[PDB]
Symmetry: C4
């Protein structure tokens, strides 16, 4: 017996976390169709491996926004990680740096940007929502810059929260001793106002506004149509992240893997297009990249592994994924990321 | 624990109603393929949401036949509602008016048009079948007009009853104290003659006949082919209701959501086209409207909620649906019904 | 509780017949894929009903080979019916005549042509295989003609028996007191030689040979490709029966309903094309006819009903089917068989 | 009760072999999608049988690389067969010769080429991997030639081992008394070095190298794209074996039956194209040949039958398959292999 794949962590997490906590991390929106589809869609893409190629040395390094990382597998911003393990964001922070990759911190983290920054050096991104109190947004950005965060990931798919029914039936509440640390300290319990601070009037001009208060590259997270992808480009986006929020917002939106190519083509190679949602295997990673993605982000796997084995769990998840990805490149006949091509894959919609 | 979706009422209704009553409301025709398909088909239509749009104020109001209602979700005519709850049609009547929407009364109701009318003011439609005794039909129409009913919904898909096997095995009978109140009073137990009064010789000329005894707009309920949709238009129909009778008539007829577009195109915008059957979620509502429907009607959800919590249940069903529909519009980037478009959706048959 | 559909007889038959007998009647070839598919394929064809049509009088009568019958539902030749009920072929014979339809007798019947003929008057067909001993074939034909059988149905899909594994595991044997009565009497235990009498050298010239020893119309049973359908026409076939032997021969042959249209088109209206296999509902009957079939034949339903209720069971099966077929015509808007059209149906392959 | 099909051996093997051994033989790569698909794909190809054809004598003999064999069903190289039964490769060797067919020996066999050769005369192929120690490869080839092996089957789909998770959880190890006999004797425990001897720098020039140390025909095993098929032809391959290694390498590669035609067309009839993976029925064999394959190879069925009944089991598997294949040819109207055609089949992708 031994953990051999990322998905097995979900079971352990489930068996140890309180229903409320597990359900919060595991649930999708309403009937959870897209949740299931995010995983199932990958099963509709097949390989066309090239044999008899010198695959002695496999290079998985890539350059994201000028930064060079070990692999094209980064960590997505989850939220309230300390509900999964006392160390929460700390464990995830150290694990990301050690793995040689990027970690995106959530504004709703149970640790502050500076708390995370102290763990050690590493390339980090900050996820944020343009709240009603623009002054609070300015403060958060300024605070992230000081902590040395390299970019801002603006999430544009939550003008209003999706209906994750399990949470409603459970009557979800943030446990007693946890706190949204990034909101502790600057000029404004914390769970209700921050939730009530969501500004639903946001439009493309607010994207411009963000650009006038920070020089950090802005990544739009939550684009799934070619129409918005073009607008994101026109409005100075540094990159686009094809995401359906882990299927927790609007159910019946396609699987990110299916929508990806449409977004990649819309971008016309002007800016990097990334993807998240459903990634659990190295084979998943190879397909996303063969379809045009510059890299991918993982969410749930982090919190599940964190609950099961803390930092070791997160390190284990990152190692398994890079190993699987390497072996996939090897068996496909690709020695570097640049060698992966659309012809190495075959989609059910081809 | 708490009710978070319309479908959950069916379980409660089932656990409390007598087999005979539940089966009568729940069953489809014969092998019940279309019953299952009415729900499953919606799962084959996906969204293409627009992000970064000011979705501060969402307008769900619409004008149906000159009447302005709160939402495009109306109640379909069921039958013998008092089998589900002592108040039956009364509870449904008050709930519809309070919700600010239209309620279609069935000729086989366990309450009379005037009984319903007394609950309070509200826009109501009357469902009827051209019986052999045309004189009884005239009386019913005249009686509905006095009660202030705004339109007549003529059902044309039941020349003969479908075979709902559960009813046959159960030997379905109307409970002792209930009565088809609309037939009580005018010139003609009630379950057998009214069932034997079905006129199967009806053709388009009888539609004309109805038009010579009433000035109320006539809605044809039960059209699912483009051929009949055109005829309905030619024969002065005020609107068409794409319906397969909740899959209780001819099994193997397509899901209303699949047939809808064909009917919408046939109508050429000359008259409103509505839909019913399988609607259980706000996402269902958005798809029907994105496909051309002017509004939708719900059947079973009413009787199930009625059995579970009487009027409160019906109010709960209507609130949940409008809430879900609103959040869907918000996440899709639509501020009014006029903003919903075919491009906001993606069908498996595209 | 009450029997409401043909398929329910299989359960009763199963619960009362010995494993060996049930398995013999119920099994398909090897992995039984086509068995399942014969039924499932019908689920891939939908209706396009016409409403508001005078459906007061429905005419199901048809003329098959000059003979006028009550409905386009005939009985297929099964075998050793007395294993299902003491009366076997007798009950089936009386039931067919009473129902006003045709019954095809198998050469392997546990009753002789003359035994069946004595039950009463009725239009009957005789199924036969060109055995090695052509003299035995001549005798069988002559014997059928005397008994007043109207046509010969030559089965061309069994040059060698398919592998019905259940029979092998069960070590199937004909019960002690039963006998292949048609072979008793003329010039040649009976189970082994008759099985060993199968001539696998048969080709189109042998079809011609049959035509020189009888003037009765010859129906080829077991044609499923357009290539053979044309040959059947060229070689004086009186009609073609699209059949896959109830999926008991070569597994992975398409469902008869799927292959039908190809055969109908090949025939070019020169001769009637019939179908069998999987027919269990009136909706099944309407689809087969809408696709071009002149009528259909049923197999297993006869033996299952026979085991459950003897003749009454068979009468019940025939009544249920005509009732279901009538109601389907009524709901589709078809007053006669001639009114059924391809446009009243919609196939998944359209 | 009695064994009626090849697949039933897996159950017996499972119920008697130790988890570790069964899992090693039965498992696929990671989530085992292609494992399931290798079998399921055959279900998507249907027959178009020709009736009324003289199928008295069926000829299944074929000429592979100049050698004439009884049937187009050969044995694929498995590995460590003695884990399944004390006799291992011996039983398989005698069974293959008796069946009148070819057996491919694995370099990792628990019996040596000469040990196998002593069982008796028979046409045999040797499977091999170009190890780092080219000198060991030369020795193996020379050793095979002496034992009278007719050809070398070079496997090109394992530059690195796939992740068969069950083995990892089980901590698979070669039982105490077994030995990789081909490595015992010549100039180089055995499980770890031989596994560490895999050369992952192999490319097409190494294929040429093999051709300069042996005159035996070289068969490339593991080609699944048309691109590699052409290269295999250009580089003097004697034949191509479309294989996905029994789905144990890279998951999400298509089923061999689906990829086959692409490879057949690429070869342009210049060299024979074979197939393996998922073959379990004679119907499977007919489809592979109708698609262009010159013959097929079976893997798992050998080890499962071996575990259940030793040599008798293997003889039983080979007999069942030829019987099933014969009956399929008979029912399709094919008297010889040359008579099987693409028109006798119908693929879901046609
Ligand atoms: C428990 C949880 C919390 C999340 N929190 C955020 C968040 O703080 N910010 C954000 O933009 N997205 C959030 N997401 C979603 C993204 O981080 C991301 O798209 C991700 O969940 C990707 O899909 P995966 O979980 O299938 O890997 C959250 C997802 C989960 C499951
Ligand atoms: C118990 C029950 C009674 C019905 N009674 C009527 C009726 O009186 N008149 C009519 O035209 N349709 C009747 N229908 C069907 C329609 O009201 C309507 O098409 C509806 O059931 C829509 O589908 P849904 O139940 O899936 O929402 C009935 C349906 C049910 C389940
Ligand atoms: C038990 C049994 C016996 C059969 N016997 C014969 C027979 O004697 N002659 C023949 O041509 N076909 C025979 N068939 C098949 C046909 O009668 C016929 O194609 C039929 O089974 C149609 O399919 P169904 O069973 O799905 O209705 C037999 C089928 C069964 C199940
Ligand atoms: C237990 C086992 C051992 C295998 N050993 C080898 C081997 O030694 N050499 C090789 O090239 N392929 C090996 N394969 C795979 C091939 O022999 C072959 O492609 C085969 O398994 C075909 O598929 P099937 O098992 O579905 O019939 C092995 C497969 C199994 C299941
Ligand atoms: C300003 C937007 C508010 C969202 C923040 C939280 C969602 C609701 C918290 C529990 C009720 S946690 C989170 N952040 N972003 N998405 C989520 C997620 O849980 O899916
Ligand atoms: C004049 C037509 C007669 C139909 C009225 C009833 C159907 C049968 C009543 C129980 C046997 S109730 C009803 N009304 N319309 N459809 C139904 C339905 O139950 O599906
Ligand atoms: C001359 C051909 C021999 C077939 C006759 C019988 C089949 C085998 C009898 C039980 C072993 S009964 C029968 N007749 N035709 N098909 C069948 C069937 O059982 O599918
Ligand atoms: C030089 C390549 C090494 C592969 C040989 C073995 C695979 C691993 C042995 C158990 C850990 S047995 C084998 N040989 N080829 N494929 C396999 C298989 O088991 O799938």
């Amino acid at each position: 017996m031994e953990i051999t794949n990322v998905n097995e962590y979900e079971a352990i997490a489930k068996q140890k976390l309180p229903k409320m906590v597990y359900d919060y991390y595991a649930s999708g929106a309403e009937d959870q169709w897209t949740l299931a589809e995010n995983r199932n869609a990958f099963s509709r893409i097949l390989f066309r491996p090239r044999i008899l190629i010198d695959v002695t040395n496999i290079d998985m390094t890539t350059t994201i926004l000028g930064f060079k990382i070990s692999m094209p597998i980064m960590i997505a911003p989850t939220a309230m990680q300390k509900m999964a393990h006392p160390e929460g964001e700390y464990a995830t922070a150290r694990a990301a740096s050690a793995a040689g990759t990027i970690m995106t911190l959530s504004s709703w983290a149970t640790s502050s940007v500076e708390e995370v920054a102290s763990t050690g050096p590493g390339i980090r991104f900050f996820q944020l929502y343009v709240y009603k109190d623009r002054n609070v947004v300015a403060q958060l950005v300024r605070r992230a810059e000081r902590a040395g965060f390299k970019a801002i990931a603006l999430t544009v798919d939550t003008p209003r929260l999706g209906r994750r029914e399990a949470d409603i039936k459970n009557r979800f509440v943030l446990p007693p001793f946890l706190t949204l640390k990034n909101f502790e300290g600057i000029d404004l319990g914390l769970s209700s106002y921050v939730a009530g601070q969501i500004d639903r009037s946001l439009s493309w001009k607010d994207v411009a506004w963000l650009q006038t208060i920070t020089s950090l590259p802005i990544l739009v997270k939550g684009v799934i149509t070619a129409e918005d992808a073009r607008l994101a480009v026109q409005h100075g986006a540094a990159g686009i992240i094809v995401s359906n929020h882990g299927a927790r917002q609007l159910d019946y939106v396609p699987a990110t893997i299916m929508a990806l190519e449409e977004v990649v083509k819309a971008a016309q190679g002007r800016i990097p297009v990334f993807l998240d949602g459903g990634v659990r295997r190295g084979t998943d990673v190879f397909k996303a990249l063969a379809l045009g993605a510059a890299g991918v982000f993982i969410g749930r796997p982090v919190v599940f592994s964190l609950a099961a084995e803390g930092e070791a769990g997160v390190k284990k998840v990152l190692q398994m994924m890079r190993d699987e990805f390497e072996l996939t490149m090897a068996l496909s006949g690709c020695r570097s990321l640049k060698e992966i091509s659309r012809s190495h894959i075959a989609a059910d919609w081809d």
